[PDB]
């Protein structure tokens, strides 16, 4: 689905940009922001490439930004 119904826990779209317009950092990458959201650690969260996901049960899907001045930001994904 390229849209979300609720919080976006089941969102497996190809959107890889935050609401700020920044390209999300790869979940399999520790650059430029280091994290513990390892795709192999959470395989049931469908962490692929740098697509916006909701693996922590947040309000809206998010991702790490490409800006070292901002750890992470929420993504802008349309609702169904």
């Amino acid at each position: 689905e390229e849209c979300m119904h609720g919080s976006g826990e089941n969102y497996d779209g190809k959107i890889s940009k935050t609401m700020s317009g920044l390209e999300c950092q790869a979940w399999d990458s520790q650059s430029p922001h280091a994290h513990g959201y390892i795709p192999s650690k959470f395989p049931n969260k469908n962490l692929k490439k740098n697509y916006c996901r909701n693996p922590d049960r947040d309000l809206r899907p998010w991702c790490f930004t490409t800006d070292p001045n901002k750890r992470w930001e929420y993504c802008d994904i349309p609702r169904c």
């Binding site: 049931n44 922590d56 049960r57 947040d58 901002k70 750890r71």
Partner: protein, 57 residues
């Protein structure tokens, strides 16, 4: 297991229990940290200077 149901359940309920257990207690402090850090930048910029410096929150 014997029926292979365990491999089907994949301990999804077990993982979900940890989700609410953690509740992003760590990430919460991280966000709050960056919040004041960003504000510090404005204080260094001095656009208005509405901080006497006596209390400093």
């Amino acid at each position: 297991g014997s029926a292979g149901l365990q491999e089907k359940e994949r301990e999804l309920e077990d993982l979900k229990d940890a989700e609410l257990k953690r509740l992003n207690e760590e990430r919460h402090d991280h966000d709050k940290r960056e919040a004041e850090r960003k504000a510090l930048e404005d204080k260094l910029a001095d656009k208005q200077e509405h901080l006497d410096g006596a209390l400093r929150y």
